[PDB]
């Protein structure tokens, strides 16, 4: 049905709020509920209620204190007024679900960091929320280099959230290595190519585990297959093979920092 | 069967550690299930591996650094060897129970303290775990003021713990009031007098509301009643009357103390 | 019609405010509007555009700069948010009521506090507002104690008013005790205790006009008389009861500490 | 037998602690002989007595003051338990030995160090000896990977003890390039790149006698023919290869930063 799928995102998004950390970040919540809100009024018809209704978000965020998740609200209302106005439902309901996924992943990490838990079970959790949105955003019809730019922006949203809060910068840098890493390894497996996917995964867990070195290795030689595969096909590459290159090299930088 | 009960108790306590919290406190896990290893152990036979296990799960806490859940595990040390070698497996097990149900709120608490968590919170599931303890022990066997006085123990446990880690003495007082005045209301609901046990929780809910004076006046006037049910009894009283006469007292004491 | 009471009550206590003040606290009178517009709109189905309203009128009041009326608008705009998700559209009209009733009990105690009156019109004024918004709810549907809940906030909010303006505290002890005293004596004139009742008002009288030690013994007494009749009833005691008790041992406090 | 081998290897690596040095380190042969014991006790069946042994081994390490033995006492601790639980009997076997090859090593380097003996003795005994777990390990079933992180954990708490003692930086890169080397070419050579595995080995006497140059373009050489190799195979490549390319680009980086 799509829609539902939209809906139960949203309260299901809200639930684990609630699961992760209880009542002590409640605003977080109700942001949640109210994109939520809003995503549904845009289904219908009626774009005047969703403008509102992330005008009301802009402000409960401006209160918060998230200087990064303000930032991304004031460019979600931008942008989702334009296209409203213009008649883009789909990227709008893009925008909105990536704002309620930002401040989502942003109550978690700051909960997770607060009561001092290892980067591995962050990084877990955030590759896995990016999956389920971008398996959302794939079925309502955004094409793949938008959701990819959302999920990058969701991603610095967080880091920025993290930087800001006090975490060490090997840290953060180690959970969005991570977090690359396995949106790459979903875009080669779905790809077919299955034995890439497991050695960026491979990868991954070891860098995870304080191995970098090796994880820099593997991460190198998979990133020179790929190259190989890629100027194999020539100009006929789908576009799931470039955007994992980026995704890799980016994944690369990071290691290399830490 | 109850024996499984105390192994499904062991194992769904260290489950609701992991669920709160996560890996940011897995000492705590590890020591809920070496006594729940302890536990089993009892329940077979052997009597010499049970104080192995607790004199590790000892060493354990010791390093931790918590001095009154540590005094905790002296005396219940001190106290299950003699038991077991005289032959009171039933308090031994009592006593191992209570401290594993000392350490998972000791847990629980400082996450909440950690994360901000309003006092509402803490006090229903410290209330719920009690009520659990106090059905399981009641189904194994222990009189009840020995299990009234080992609640108030693991109280006094998770009360030093607040006290020690930083919070406000009214917060305290507040959560150590709403958890007598739960046990209370269980007792008294045990015997019947439904409508007493409604007006005490009664009195608990407009106590975590905020509303100090109106719950101290509703309490003050469930203690005249009580008292006068219990003067017309005469010598043939239940225990419980007089376990929620004292529960409510002290109740009442900290509530003033507020 | 009890809907057609609803949007007058709005309305009259917006004409209210104008008449005691006039144009000097117009924003009041503008969030008094805007309250009974989201009202209205609640009943009809709409509960978005009542979330809207509500914050339109919490921007008003942090722009009034009121702290206490922007605590309760913040809690009013969450638990009606909540409700209205869930479905209780009639705690959501009993929130959105009692807010408007304390803007507008603000605005007159100001008022009233500037031009230098007495305090004996001041309690008389709120009382008789009290007394118009519980009957209010009371034909819609709330349940009494919630009602007493939201006038005791409603009577708080204005006590914080009244505090951080500057006036003594004494007279705020008077006001709130003369406030309490006619909510207890409509609660048990309700129930057909007249001579209560009307011992109550005494006291009320007594307590305004000076006359301190005197409205103290004789509300000291009709509390004894109270707990004879509460206590010969048992436990079969109607709410009404109870619920004086509470309100006549907040007004022996506060009279007691002028 | 595989499970005669344990208790050998145990005992027999207790006996080379005692020829290597005497009496002069006794608490480390003490502790090699505890976790023969924990073994012997994971084989028949007994799973909380490990525990114990294991507790006991702890605490005397934790006596010694070793501390990078003491983290890997607290984790294998951890993790065997865990697995013990769950039923991994050989994960555990794995963990232990580790620990014990762990202890030995530590020992044995210690006194060589204390007595003034060049790095090629300690090289060629550490080799050995992780050559001889490595062969148990694979007898007993751990997954090749396993061993290999267990092996590079050894080999990072000798690190540790050896940069804690006072050795100067450059023998310590020696050594641990050429236990890496070492591996890499046992490794290789099980494949049946035997010719490859010569190479390895004269890079590591090359590297030894101080000749540090020559062993690092033989080793460049021997990793870009490897490379070579792996990418000739494609997917298909068994993890030996895998592993030996991260064990030389290990070794790479040691032998570039002497
Ligand atoms: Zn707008
Ligand atoms: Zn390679
Ligand atoms: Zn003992
Ligand atoms: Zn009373
Ligand atoms: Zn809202
Ligand atoms: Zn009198
Ligand atoms: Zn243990
Ligand atoms: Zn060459």
């Keep these: 049905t799509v829609e539902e799928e939209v809906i139960r995102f949203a309260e299901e998004l809200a639930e684990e709020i609630r699961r992760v950390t209880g009542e002590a970040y409640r605003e977080y919540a109700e942001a949640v509920r109210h994109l939520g809100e809003a995503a549904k009024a845009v289904l219908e ?4 209620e969703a403008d509102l209704i992330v005008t009301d978000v802009l402000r409960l965020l401006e209160r918060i204190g998230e200087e990064g998740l303000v930032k991304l609200a ?7 007024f334009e296209l409203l106005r213009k008649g883009n439902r789909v990227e709008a309901l893009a925008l909105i679900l990536a704002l309620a996924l930002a401040v989502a992943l942003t109550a978690v990490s700051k909960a997770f960091f607060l009561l001092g838990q290892p980067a591995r079970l962050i ?3 955030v590759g896995e929320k990016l999956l389920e949105l971008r398996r959302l955003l794939e079925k309502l019809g955004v094409p793949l280099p938008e959701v990819i730019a959302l999920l990058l922006r969701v991603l610095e949203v967080v880091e920025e959230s993290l930087k800001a809060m006090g975490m060490e910068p090997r840290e953060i ?7 690359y890493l396995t949106l790459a390894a979903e875009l080669l497996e779905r790809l ?8 960026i995964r491979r990868a991954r867990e070891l860098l995870l585990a304080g191995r970098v070195e090796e994880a820099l290795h593997l991460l190198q030689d998979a990133v020179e297959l790929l190259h190989e595969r890629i100027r194999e096909l020539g100009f006929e590459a789908p576009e799931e093979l470039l955007l994992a290159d980026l995704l890799l090299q980016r994944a690369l ?3 290399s920092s830490i």
Tied chains: 1, 2, 3, 4.
């Design 253 to 255: 930088e990071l290691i």
């Design 173 to 179: 840098n180690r959970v969005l290595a991570a977090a």
């Design 45 to 48: 018809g009626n774009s005047v």
């Design 192 to 199: 077919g190519l299955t034995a890439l996917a497991a050695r």
């Design 123 to 125: 990084a877990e959790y």
């Design 74 to 80: 004031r460019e979600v209302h931008e942008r989702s």
